[PDB]
Write a sequence for this structure.
């Protein structure tokens, strides 16, 4: 009944099949031994196919059957707390996963008329970017830098910051999390899974992984299945956050699979259409309108660069595609700034409507003296001859740049961030040794959680500060300043 | 059922078979050379399936003298090597033939060489510590038991002497077994290493296998698989801690490159094969050690043209942890350990895991070195007087730091004429803390050159 | 006063040197790109 | 197993051998030399590089 073909070629994970006149493009095919294939290049003589799974089990006498199906994946709601390969099978021995629906991987993105503006905060634990470059629901942000700078740490901190939000039963604040690991070492996957498990956040997140051993082409289509998993929840008025561990390896895999068959090569032997792939992948995230339900998806891609060459092909394409950028410099990382993020060039193009009004007030003041300290750093040698205003600006910039750095695996609450930034920008850091600046505030913060926690509740309820709040804070500051002892002598105002 | 050869061109050969008798992939075939001057038995490995029942195969030994129409015999299975604990103490060929004595151990058990890597469930992170007795390694890039270690650098930097020093430092007094492999190395080094091992009492518990540069490309991409097969057998059956040593793994990649052109594959950006990452990933995954068993693997890699942006080293960086890097400037300025402190790091270092004093000392010294570098970039032209007191203090402290960071070595004592030594970890951390404090500013930098420990510092300083 | 004048002259001598170096680097980068693309396309279509 | 580097700059400078001690090494080293030369010479290469 069904059309059956043969095999004519085999090598480097490529097979040519003669037959199947009725075959459609990108139709999954079956090979003896339970081998999966994908049709990717049609022709009147024969059709090419990339091999999924086993390779050395292919010869010239095999028979081929067509599944009559294009591409799909079980997208049920039982994937939370499970590790799954890109195809859909569970890697662990916990057992299979109950599923409810099957959806394709080539659905159209929401149209222009279905869009909506963005105004939600989408808070994170890193105070280095919340006050500098706000991130909102349905908005695309990119992180760029060199190897061993610490980007995965920022990713996992953002992932695990949502514990308090998940604690409440409100479906209008719960956020689901999807992690995609591409072409990595399995031990690293185990380590990050263990870190998440000991953080307690494994109960509301999912992981899809494709280690470096996947020569079958699984590295080609992991983000597709991740986005397909996310979209089912995103069409139900629920908020999802998706992280891609890397994308350069995806491009390399696509280039290799194209070069293996006949494809005209452009720059750097890259195939004909690379920009289209990333564009159509990264245009799925969007804040739906109120009529559709109100669900949202926020994506986070990652790109690795060599020798800070931001003028290459892939980095240029991704920078053009994306909506916001953040930069990490290994020089800053070696300098001693743990959040190596460079405030000089990283810019988010949203209007700042995502964040809350108090931090909106304080960020404007922060920008000015940050720029002043950045420009006036050369006069450190002759600081005696400078003017009093210049000295004050230099000292304020020094204290500020000392304030921002934080240790990893320590997310910060929004009330705590607001209080810390307000304390920094109001001149209360004067007459304090710079090193103890890192210590002192933390201890002070703890005291606020002990006897005066009502301020955090007021900030939660009102999303702003009142005169009574600020006078209570200044009174508490004056109380605690005398109690704290400096590491070198003591001094208070 | 024999088939026949149709084309011969360099290392690659083309064979045809009767219909129905086509061999599977990765099999082995035998061919005969009848010329009197050079008689051999060629072993062919099939690598490409083609139409009309033709196969492209690679050769294992040089193909001079072969003609057309010669029949070929099929083995029906992949190449296999002897296994067991009865192989250690002998030097073996790439195919397993004993160089010391032919026809030895041919009755041993022999099994497959190509296998799948283990499953993800059995994987487990491994965090530990092991002492080395070297100033740089114990401070900046601590090692780990059961992990992977690699040494990076360009040509003519001193990789081999470091490998010999490391085997002398670690392989001695080790409870378990050690396996060493040689890929594309100088034959003189192989001979003198064999002699040195025979000098001591460890050759009785070591298995050596290696192929040289003079061999055709067929051999240069197969010996590592044999070494991994031996190590896998020892780990799985007997179950003890094992050490693995590999030299210049980069040659393996080169072995593919030429054949990539002969097989018809299109070239990549720098003329590389399009599918290097997959093969290297398969190898590195095969390297792994599951929980309940330990494998300590150390490798050296060669940087081509002293360029770090080459496509090949990126994958090496990806599949690694706790690496070291060798540069050329420090070698030019006469520092024997060519490690660059500003471009090497390790994952295991952690205030929770290792400690807080170690971490603070490392951070302080690396910051000081960075400051010295970007200060020297200007002081080289504008002169010393252009800076303030703090800058000059930092420059002097940094100069003393890089002077003191060198050490004398075991295997290199003949060049220096004086035997080296080893130092404890606590002494190193205390001495470096004292150096960061700024107490040794009263001594000349010449006392810090090629020193070991602190008593030697005192003796050398009093010698002037 | 002489120090002021000399330092100003030094800055005005450094800036254009920076510009010339930038131009040379740009032309070198373009030449390199053309070189490797020509080599790869020749190797590809030589088959 | 060893390299010798000659640069035109040193030859122009006035050094007739015109060889730089920075990047010239020998694998064998002192083993080849006669013993008396070994004690007399010492580590002169390192001193020159310094
Ligand atoms: N805020 C921080 N404070 C202290 N250490 C940090 C911080 N962020 C990262 N690190 C450390 O810096 C190193 C960077 O690790 P990480 O894997 O995140 O780097 P990366 O730039 O993503 O590189 P890659 O993914 O290639 O390994 C790790 O040792 C990590 O512990
Ligand atoms: N500690 C040392 N003492 C003396 N010579 C050294 C030392 N380390 C390296 N060398 C020099 O390095 C050379 C060895 O380099 P080698 O490892 O062969 O480079 P490659 O690995 O690129 O082949 C030797 O000739 C030796 O003189
Ligand atoms: Mg990382
Ligand atoms: Mg060497």
């Amino acid at each position: 009944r069904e059309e059956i073909g043969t095999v004519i070629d085999a090598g480097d994970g490529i097979a040519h099949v003669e037959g199947l006149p009725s075959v459609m493009t990108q139709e999954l095919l079956e090979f003896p031994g339970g081998v999966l294939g994908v049709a990717l290049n049609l022709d009147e003589h024969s059709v090419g196919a990339v091999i999924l799974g086993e390779f050395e089990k292919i010869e010239e006498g095999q028979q081929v059957k067509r599944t009559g199906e294009v591409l799909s994946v079980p997208v049920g709601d039982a994937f939370l707390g499970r590790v799954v390969n890109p195809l859909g099978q569970p890697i662990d021995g916990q057992g299979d996963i109950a599923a409810e629906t099957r959806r394709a991987l080539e659905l159209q993105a929401p149209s222009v008329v279905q869009r909506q503006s963005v105004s939600e905060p989408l808070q994170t634990g890193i105070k280095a970017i919340d006050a500098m470059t706000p991130i909102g629901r349905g908005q695309r942000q990119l992180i760029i830098g060199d190897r061993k700078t610490g980007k995965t740490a920022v990713c996992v901190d953002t992932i695990l910051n949502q514990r308090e939000a998940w604690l409440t039963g409100d479906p209008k604040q719960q956020v689901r999390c999807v992690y995609v690991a591409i072409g990595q070492k399995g031990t690293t996957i185990a380590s990050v899974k263990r870190a998440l498990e000991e953080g307690g956040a494994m109960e509301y997140t999912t992981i899809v992984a494709a280690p470096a051993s996947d020569a079958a082409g699984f590295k080609w289509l992991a983000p597709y299945t991740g986005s397909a998993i996310g979209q089912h929840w995103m069409y139900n008025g629920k908020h999802v956050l998706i992280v891609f561990d890397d994308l350069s390896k995806q491009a390399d895999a696509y280039r290799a699979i194209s070069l293996l068959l006949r494809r005209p090569p452009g720059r750097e032997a890259f195939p004909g259409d690379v920009f289209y792939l990333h564009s159509r992948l990264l245009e799925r995230c969007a804040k739906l309108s109120d009529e559709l339900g109100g669900g949202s998806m926020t994506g986070l891609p990652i790109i690795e660069t060599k020798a800070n060459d931001i003028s290459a092909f892939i980095p240029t394409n991704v920078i053009s595609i994306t909506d916001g950028q953040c930069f990490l410099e290994s020089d800053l990382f070696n300098q001693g700034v743990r959040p190596a993020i460079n405030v000089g060039v990283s810019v988010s193009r949203v209007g700042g409507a995502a964040q809350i009004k108090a931090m909106k007030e304080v960020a404007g003041s922060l920008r000015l003296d940050l720029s002043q300290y950045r420009e006036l750093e050369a006069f450190a040698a002759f600081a005696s001859d400078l003017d009093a205003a210049s000295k004050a600006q230099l000292d304020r910039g020094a204290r500020l740049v000392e304030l921002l750095k934080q240790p990893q695996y320590s997310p910060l609450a929004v009330e705590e961030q607001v209080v810390a930034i307000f304390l920094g920008t109001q001149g209360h850091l004067d007459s304090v040794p710079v090193e103890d600046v890192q210590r002192f505030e933390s201890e002070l913060l703890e005291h606020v959680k002990a006897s005066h926690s009502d301020i955090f509740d007021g900030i939660r309820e009102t999303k702003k500060l009142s005169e009574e709040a600020e006078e209570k804070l200044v009174s508490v500051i004056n109380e605690f300043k005398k109690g704290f002892q400096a590491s070198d002598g003591s001094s208070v105002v | 059922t024999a088939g026949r050869v149709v084309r011969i061109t360099g290392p690659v050969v083309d064979v045809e078979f009767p219909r129905g008798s086509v061999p599977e992939l990765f099999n082995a075939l035998h061919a005969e050379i009848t010329f009197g001057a050079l008689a051999k038995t060629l072993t062919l490995e099939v690598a490409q399936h083609l139409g009309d029942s033709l196969v492209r195969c690679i050769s294992m030994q040089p193909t001079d003298g072969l003609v057309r129409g010669v029949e070929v015999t099929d083995t029906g299975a992949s190449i296999s090597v002897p296994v067991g604990d009865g192989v250690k103490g002998h030097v073996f060929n790439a195919l397993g033939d004993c160089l010391d004595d032919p026809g030895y151990g041919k009755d041993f058990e022999h099994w497959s060489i190509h296998r799948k890597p283990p499953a993800f469930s059995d994987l487990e992170p491994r965090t530990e510590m092991l002492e080395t007795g070297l100033k740089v390694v114990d401070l900046l890039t601590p090692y780990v038991r059961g992990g992977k270690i690699a040494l990076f650098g360009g040509a003519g930097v001193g990789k081999t002497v470091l490998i010999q020093e490391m085997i002398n430092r670690i392989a001695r007094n080790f409870g378990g077994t050690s396996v060493f492999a040689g890929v594309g190395e100088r034959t003189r080094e192989g001979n003198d290493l064999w002699v040195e091992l025979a000098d001591a009492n460890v050759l009785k518990d070591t298995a050596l296998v290696f192929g040289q540069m003079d061999e055709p490309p067929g051999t240069r991409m197969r010996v590592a698989l044999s070494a991994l097969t031996m190590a896998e057998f020892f780990r799985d059956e007997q179950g003890q801690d094992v050490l693995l040593f590999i030299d210049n793994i980069f040659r393996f990649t080169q072995a593919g490159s030429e054949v990539s052109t002969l097989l018809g594959r299109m070239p990549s950006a720098v003329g590389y094969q399009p599918t290097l990452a997959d093969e290297m990933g398969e190898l590195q995954e095969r390297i792994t050690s599951t929980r309940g068993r330990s494998i300590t693997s150390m490798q050296a890699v060669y940087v081509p043209a002293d360029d770090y942006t080459d496509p090949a080293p990126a994958t090496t960086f990806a599949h690694l942890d706790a690496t070291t890097e060798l540069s050329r400037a420090v070698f030019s300025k006469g520092i024997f350990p060519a490690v660059d402190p500003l471009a090497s790091s390790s994952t295991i270092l952690d205030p929770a895991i290792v400690g807080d004093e170690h971490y603070r000392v490392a951070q302080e010294v690396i910051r000081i070195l960075q400051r010295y570098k970007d200060l020297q970039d200007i002081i080289a032209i504008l002169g010393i007087d252009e800076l303030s007191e703090e800058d000059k203090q930092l420059v002097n402290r940094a100069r003393r730091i890089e002077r003191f960071l060198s050490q004398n070595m075991m295997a290199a004592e003949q060049f220096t004429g004086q035997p080296g030594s080893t130092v404890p970890l606590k002494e190193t951390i205390e001495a470096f803390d004292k150096l960061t404090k700024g107490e040794f500013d009263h001594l000349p930098e010449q006392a810090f050159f090629l020193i070991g420990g602190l008593d030697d510092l005192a003796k050398k300083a009093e010698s002037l | 006063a002489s120090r002021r004048r000399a330092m100003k002259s030094a800055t005005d001598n450094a800036d254009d040197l920076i510009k010339a170096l930038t131009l040379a680097a740009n032309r070198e980068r373009q030449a390199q790109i053309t070189q490797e693309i020509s080599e790869i396309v020749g190797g590809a279509n030589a088959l």
About this structure: Chain A touches chain C at residues 265, 267-269 (CB under 8 Å). The CA atoms of residues 74 and 102 of chain A lie 5 Å apart. The first helix of chain A runs from residue 127 to 130.
